[PDB]
Amino acid sequence: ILENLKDVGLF
Amino acid sequence: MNGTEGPNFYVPFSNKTGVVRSPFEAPQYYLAEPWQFSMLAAYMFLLIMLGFPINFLTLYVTVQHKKLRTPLNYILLNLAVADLFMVFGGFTTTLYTSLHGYFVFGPTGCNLEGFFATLGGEIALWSLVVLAIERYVVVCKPMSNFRFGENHAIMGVAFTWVMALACAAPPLVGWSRYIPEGMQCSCGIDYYTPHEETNNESFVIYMFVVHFIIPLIVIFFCYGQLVFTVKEAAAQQQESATTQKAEKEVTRMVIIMVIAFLICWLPYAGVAFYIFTHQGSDFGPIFMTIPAFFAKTSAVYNPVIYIMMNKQFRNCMVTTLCCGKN
Ligand SMILES: *[C@@H]1O[C@H](CO)[C@@H](O[C@@H]2O[C@H](CO)[C@@H](O[C@@H]3O[C@H](CO)[C@@H](O)[C@H](O[C@H]4O[C@H](CO)[C@@H](O)[C@H](O)[C@@H]4O)[C@@H]3O)[C@H](O)[C@H]2NC(C)=O)[C@H](O)[C@H]1NC(C)=O
Ligand SMILES: OC[C@H]1O[C@H](O[C@H]2O[C@H](CO)[C@@H](O)[C@H](O)[C@H]2O)[C@H](O)[C@@H](O)[C@@H]1O
Ligand SMILES: CCCCCCCCO[C@@H]1O[C@H](CO)[C@@H](O)[C@H](O)[C@H]1O
Ligand SMILES: CCCCCCCCO[C@@H]1O[C@H](CO)[C@@H](O)[C@H](O)[C@H]1O
Ligand SMILES: CCCCCCCCO[C@@H]1O[C@H](CO)[C@@H](O)[C@H](O)[C@H]1O
Incomplete structure (x- = not known):
């Protein structure tokens, strides 16, 4: 999820 | 009788003393002290001095930084x-x-001002809805093998524009109306005077359900699942301190974004719904x-939460604001 979380700017 | 009706307005002040004037023609200094008007001007001035830089710098750094120009950021620019x-x-x-103390631009200006102000706030509103969806x-990946790209992203931005026009245009053509509001210096949707010639009762509910309830639910579902998907993936990965931080940092942002949306x-919602329930009682200008x-x-505060607490927008802004360094 981390890579998907950085793509959305939430982490 | 707590008001004063006119052809294209409603002054919330009794004309039993003969003092009420059209908010297009003469200052409404009888429903508010002239300093209360100055304080209104003071506040408007503040939102310009903060709103314009922040939202403009958001547009500016995206021009200076190749890495900001990603499809998942389009909705954020649309917001700015x-x-x-x-x-x-x-x-x-x-x-x-x-x-001046009154809406000097006449009813025509009242429709222009009301339209673009309503349009601006609803594009932003649905922008938050679209972003939550994306x-x-x-993250949650409901559709297997799906990939979000530039094509889907442009659809998202256009969707806000259709939804926003779906709210800002009907008052120009008779399903509601823009009238002077509150202290009569700004123009908005007439949600508080039954005007069967324009069927306000229907439009308010259309607004309340479509524009309010639907986003409230989408944003609650979309972000509900997201914290869940992130909570679960963290429990299965407790050996990763980073994955544990992300869960906490994401939970925090989701709470902020949700709470901010409510504020x-x-x-x-609460006021309009009250007026709908407690119809046409004494509601003051303030x-x-x-x-x-x-x-x-x-x-x-939307650009602050969504742009300035975004880790990259922040760094690009800092570099830009510090002449290209840091
Ligand atoms: C809030 O209430 C006030 C008072 O009720 C109201 O203001 C009043 O508006 C009327 C117009 O509807 C004004 O009446 C005018 O008075 C002048 C002189 O006093 C007349 O000349 C006007 O024209 C008459 O005479 C003309 C002759 O040439 C005729 O052609 C014409 O048809 C008229 O017969 C007219 O009588 C009145 O002066 C004001 N009162 C005050 C105190 O200003 C106001 O409109 C209300 N507000 C809202 C939003 O409704
Ligand atoms: O022109 C050079 C840059 O092209 C791209 O920048 C654009 O990418 C999209 C089209 O390819 C546009 O929709 C978007 O608005 C621009 O960011 C590329 O991404 C840049 O790295 C290039 O420098
Ligand atoms: C950028 C800020 C521009 C402010 C322009 C204010 C123009 C005020 O103009 C004045 O308005 C008064 C009522 O307030 C009227 O009584 C005066 O007749 C009118 O000259
Ligand atoms: C629950 C909401 C009921 C619909 C009517 C409320 C609309 C408030 O007003 C309208 O919406 C905009 C939103 O920014 C306001 O800021 C604008 O002044 C106006 O266009
Ligand atoms: C609609 C989106 C709102 C989701 C907010 C969920 C916040 C719950 O709190 C979360 O769960 C933990 C308990 O397991 C808490 O201890 C932590 O503060 C947080 O991780």
Whole structure:
């Protein structure tokens, strides 16, 4: 999820 | 009788003393002290001095930084543009009109101002809805083998524009109307006077359900699942301190974004719904501006939450603001 979380700017 | 009807307005002040004037023609210094008008002007001035840089710098750094120009950021730019509509449509105008004491631009200006201010705030509103959707899709992955790209992203931005026009245009063509509001210096949707010639009762519910309830639910579902998807993936990965931080940092942001959304639009909902339930009672001018105070400031705190707490937008902004360094 981390890579998907950085793509959305939430982490 | 707590008001004063006219052809294209409603002054919330009894004309039993013969003092009420059309908010297009003469200052409404009888429903508010002239300093209360100055304080209104002061506040409008503030939202310009903060809203314009923040939302403009958001547009500016995206021009200077290749890495900001990603499809998942398009909706964020759309947001900054929506706020700019809120700034130059509503804030600048209301600053000028507040200094005269009445909406000097006549009913025509009342429709222009009301349209672009309504358009700005709803593009921003649905922008938050679209962004919440995108993040649910990207993170929670409900559709196997799906990939979010530039094509899907442009659809998202256009969707906000259709939804926003779906709310800002009907009052121009008879399903509601823009009239002077509160202290009569700004123009908005007539949600508080039954006007069967325009079927306000229907439009308010259309607004309340379509524009309010639907986003409230989408944003609650989309972000509900997201925290869940992130909570679960953290439990299965407790050996990763980073994955544990992300879960906490994401939970925090989801709470902030949700809460901020409520502060922005719950007041408006609560007031309009009250007037719908408790029809046409004595609602003061300043009473009407308290809902209006919260969503207008969103033109500042939405860019702060969504742009300035985004780790990259922040760094690109800092580098840009420090002449290319750091
Ligand atoms: C709030 O209430 C006030 C008072 O009720 C109201 O203001 C009043 O508006 C009327 C117009 O509807 C004004 O009446 C005018 O008075 C002048 C002189 O006093 C007349 O000349 C006007 O025209 C008459 O005479 C003309 C002759 O040439 C005729 O052609 C014409 O048809 C008229 O017969 C007219 O009588 C009145 O002066 C004001 N009162 C005050 C105190 O200003 C106001 O409109 C209300 N507000 C709202 C939003 O409704
Ligand atoms: O022109 C050079 C840059 O092209 C791209 O920048 C654009 O990417 C999209 C089209 O390819 C546009 O929709 C978007 O608005 C721009 O960011 C590329 O991404 C840049 O790295 C290039 O420098
Ligand atoms: C950028 C800010 C511009 C402020 C322009 C204020 C123009 C005020 O103009 C004045 O408005 C008064 C009522 O307030 C009227 O009584 C005066 O007749 C009118 O000259
Ligand atoms: C629950 C909401 C009921 C629909 C009517 C409320 C709309 C408030 O007003 C309208 O919406 C905009 C939102 O920014 C306001 O800021 C604008 O002044 C106006 O266009
Ligand atoms: C609609 C989106 C709102 C989701 C907010 C969920 C916040 C719950 O709190 C979360 O759960 C933990 C308990 O397991 C808490 O201890 C932590 O603060 C947090 O991780």
